[PDB]
Design an enzyme around this catalytic site. Structure first.
Site, PDB file in Angstrom:
ATOM      1  N   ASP A  10      83.461  72.925  14.217  1.00  0.00           N
ATOM      2  CA  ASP A  10      84.145  74.146  13.789  1.00  0.00           C
ATOM      3  C   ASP A  10      85.654  74.093  13.978  1.00  0.00           C
ATOM      4  OD1 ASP A  10      81.718  75.291  13.128  1.00  0.00           O
ATOM      5  OD2 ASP A  10      81.829  76.935  14.564  1.00  0.00           O
ATOM      6  N   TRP A  15      92.496  75.992  11.632  1.00  0.00           N
ATOM      7  CA  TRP A  15      93.504  74.947  11.745  1.00  0.00           C
ATOM      8  C   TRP A  15      94.470  74.985  10.543  1.00  0.00           C
ATOM      9  CZ3 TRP A  15      95.024  70.681   8.831  1.00  0.00           C
ATOM     10  CH2 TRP A  15      95.770  69.692   9.492  1.00  0.00           C
ATOM     11  N   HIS A  27      90.009  71.284   5.234  1.00  0.00           N
ATOM     12  CA  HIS A  27      88.830  70.484   4.987  1.00  0.00           C
ATOM     13  C   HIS A  27      89.156  68.998   4.868  1.00  0.00           C
ATOM     14  CE1 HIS A  27      86.596  74.367   4.105  1.00  0.00           C
ATOM     15  NE2 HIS A  27      86.126  73.831   5.221  1.00  0.00           N
ATOM     16  N   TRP A  59      75.748  79.945  -0.099  1.00  0.00           N
ATOM     17  CA  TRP A  59      77.201  79.872  -0.140  1.00  0.00           C
ATOM     18  C   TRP A  59      77.715  81.105  -0.868  1.00  0.00           C
ATOM     19  CZ3 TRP A  59      76.573  77.421   3.532  1.00  0.00           C
ATOM     20  CH2 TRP A  59      76.532  76.030   3.717  1.00  0.00           C
ATOM     21  N   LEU A 121      75.648  51.726  14.205  1.00  0.00           N
ATOM     22  CA  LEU A 121      75.552  53.165  14.473  1.00  0.00           C
ATOM     23  C   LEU A 121      74.656  53.827  13.438  1.00  0.00           C
ATOM     24  CD1 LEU A 121      76.795  55.633  15.985  1.00  0.00           C
ATOM     25  CD2 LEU A 121      78.380  55.830  14.025  1.00  0.00           C
ATOM     26  N   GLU A 197      73.578  67.299  27.691  1.00  0.00           N
ATOM     27  CA  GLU A 197      74.791  67.883  28.260  1.00  0.00           C
ATOM     28  C   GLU A 197      75.389  68.673  27.087  1.00  0.00           C
ATOM     29  OE1 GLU A 197      76.075  67.545  31.356  1.00  0.00           O
ATOM     30  OE2 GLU A 197      78.166  68.309  31.131  1.00  0.00           O
TER      31      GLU A 197
HETATM   32 MG    MG Z   1      78.552  68.949  33.172  1.00  0.00          MG
END
Ligand code: MG
Ligand code: OXN
Ligand code: OXN
Ligand code: MG
Lengths: 225, 214
Positions: A10, A15, A27, A59, A121, A197
């Site tokens: 986000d 920005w 974008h 949209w 990756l 996390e």
């Molecule tokens: Mg932590």
């Protein structure tokens, strides 16, 4: 020891406005930030990177604007997937792709098929995706087997359902990063983040850089299970 | 709907052990201080118009103890008590005590207090799935009729307001398989404060963080 990172990106609009520019400017800067994050993840031994592109929400745009947008998505895949392929990246789209037009479904399939054999990756782009929808698709598959007589209700357990949710063949999600300042998961991955996390930062997505990413990895490293 | 707009709070109460260790005491002492922090939080929730408060007890002695001596107090405070989690595993006596405590307070109209014992978020989803699977096997449900809303109607606490805010004390930044399905849109508030030290101002600060969400 962080193997799989997921990100809610986000901040593009804010920005751009802060810079006195129109949304499109934010974008473009957001896409550069994606390329930077993907390179960083690959350069540092992260095995999977999952980016939230968008939910299945409609949209607020004209049908022609939407059809134009889908072709721009076709163009981005055509322009950039060959480089991702040379870089040994496996591209996968997770989410309800049946909602896309036929042409874009086919181009996604082709991009996936081209890179499926890669061992670097794994980049997952979650499009028309929702965490609850993901779990429900798996449940629907199990329900069909129960209807066939191939599965007893009492045989359904966490491991079986896990085998039917997105990305179950990849390393579990270790870290979820959300830029833009809000402290919510917003129905991004749910099942998969039970022990991840969760790192929230006020930095806007176009500004999120290698230093910010390393900061999130440090949070993960300092966890105490 | 009180002005803070928060209807349902869930809390992961970590830090009891560290809190006790810091003062040269055994973990049991921290748990007792943690129990006092639970009374404080329940009272705060009830006095601030919160509809439901859900506490993660564990995924046995101190739980059994509570039911025997705290239910009377919850009842005098018009609190509706509910235990969520896999209780089919507890000894037949604890199950009966649990059933009696809920029956006594089922008609109370104040805060609903949910205690998650032998609870896991994935387990919760799975128990809902097994219920849907039983309906498919019984011929009452077709697989393609299953959607988000339907599964939502079979997970724990579906009849209460959606969880608005999850608080986790003790410094860690994860859900640890506490509620999962239910927290899709919840504000997540992490604080380093250890659970025995979590006071009313801490609870107030968490509600203020929720009020300031965008
Ligand atoms: Mg932590
Ligand atoms: C948002 C987007 C248009 C940039 C998406 C997409 C999926 C087409 C893409 C994502 C990342 C990307 O990365 C390019 C940089 O290289 C990444 C791999 O790096 C390996 C080592 O460098 C290119 C295109
Ligand atoms: C159909 C698709 C999702 C596979 C397409 C693809 C690969 C072009 C895409 C990837 C990511 C995406 O993310 C949207 C949210 O991104 C926020 C972060 O900033 C990136 C903005 O740029 C995204 C790519 O836009 C391409 C042209 O429009 C949208 C589309
Ligand atoms: Mg917040």
């Amino acid at each position: 020891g962080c193997r799989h990172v997921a990100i809610i990106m986000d901040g593009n609009g804010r920005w751009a406005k802060k810079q006195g520019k129109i949304r499109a400017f934010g974008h473009k800067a957001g896409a550069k930030s994606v390329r930077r994050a993907v390179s960083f993840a690959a350069n540092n031994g992260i095995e999977a990177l999952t980016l939230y592109a968008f939910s299945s929400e409609n949209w607020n745009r004209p049908a022609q604007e939407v059809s134009a947008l889908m072709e721009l998505f076709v163009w981005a895949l055509d322009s950039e997937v060959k480089s991702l392929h040379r870089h040994n990246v496996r591209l996968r789209i997770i989410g309800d792709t049946s909602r896309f037009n036929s042409r874009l479904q086919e181009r996604i399939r082709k991009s996936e098929a081209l890179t499926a054999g890669n061992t670097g990756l794994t980049l997952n782009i979650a499009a028309n995706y929702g965490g609850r929808w993901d779990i429900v698709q798996g449940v629907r598959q199990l329900a069909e087997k129960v209807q066939q007589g191939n599965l007893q209700p009492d045989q359904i357990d966490e491991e079986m359902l896990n085998q039917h949710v997105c990305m179950h063949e990849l390393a579990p999600v270790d870290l979820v990063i959300r830029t833009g300042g809000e402290h919510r998961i917003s129905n991004f991955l749910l099942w998969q983040i039970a022990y991840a996390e969760l790192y929230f930062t006020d930095v806007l997505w176009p500004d999120f850089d290698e230093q910010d990413f390393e900061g999130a990895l440090n949070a993960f490293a300092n966890r105490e299970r």
